[PDB]
Design a protein around this ligand. Structure first.
Ligand code: ZN
Length: 256
């Protein structure tokens, strides 16, 4: 099936998911000079004090931190959004080297990694139904640069050993997502899609301007993950990012 290799990479996805070359595909390049300042844009509201993490899993394309979304426990509202979005999971995209890894780019600049906090619109009742709506999801994107270590991230780094290969999972309770947020909530927003198959065009992108710094050692551990299942040839999980897609008329607005 699809992956990030030469034979099943992003350039091949269109064959199985024709929407690959749709009109509101993601990620894109954020041109800071063309992005439009919108004063009608409300401040983001991140309510994660009562978040409940459950576990972490290696799905063979990335690692996911799953949360209990049976109640309005960890929610996102305000900004360009209408209604309440519930956090379901978070994952990252990274590279083989520090000069690449982000999906979205700023003025063509690539970051070391990119964190995705995925949320679904409650009016649709479940994740599965939300992915069928134009306003079904809301993903908060955060860039990672290499500098100083991120204390909040270390809990996640230490558990990777446990989910080395495709299909493994481990209990992961009492993880507070708040340790991964930058100081500023200033952002860019545009309508787009998921960055992995089914690449459904149901996402309201919310990309934070201010990146979070992670240490060399922390990102190094990400790079030790495997795409492959256990007992199979070892394929390091690196460069699990999709290249920037055409804006195609769409407009990127700024909250600042
Ligand atoms: Zn993602």
């Amino acid at each position: 099936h699809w992956g990030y290799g030469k034979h099943n990479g992003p350039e091949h996805w269109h064959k199985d998911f024709p929407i690959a070359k749709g009109e509101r595909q993601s990620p894109v390049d954020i041109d800071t000079h063309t992005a439009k300042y919108d004063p009608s844009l409300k401040p983001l509201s991140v309510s994660y004090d009562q978040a409940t993490s459950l576990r972490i899993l290696n799905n063979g394309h990335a690692f996911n931190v799953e949360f209990d979304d049976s109640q309005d426990k960890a929610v996102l509202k305000g900004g360009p959004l209408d209604g309440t979005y519930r956090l379901i999971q978070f994952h990252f995209h990274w590279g083989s080297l520090d000069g690449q890894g982000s999906e979205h780019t700023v003025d063509k600049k690539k970051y070391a990694a990119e964190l995705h906090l995925v949320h679904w619109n409650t009016k649709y009742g479940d994740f599965g139904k939300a992915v069928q709506q134009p306003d079904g999801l809301a993903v908060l994107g955060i860039f990672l640069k290499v500098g100083s270590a991120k204390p909040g991230l270390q809990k996640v780094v230490d558990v990777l050993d446990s989910i080395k290969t495709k299909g493994k999972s481990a209990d992961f309770t009492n993880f507070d997502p708040r340790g991964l947020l930058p100081e500023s909530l200033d952002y860019w927003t545009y309508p787009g899609s998921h960055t992995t198959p089914p690449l459904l065009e149901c996402v309201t992108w919310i990309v934070l301007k201010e990146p979070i710094s992670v240490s060399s050692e922390q990102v190094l551990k990400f790079r030790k993950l495997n795409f492959n299942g256990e007992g199979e040839p070892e394929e390091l999980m690196v460069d699990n990012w999709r290249p920037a897609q055409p804006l195609k008329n769409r407009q990127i607005k700024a909250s600042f």
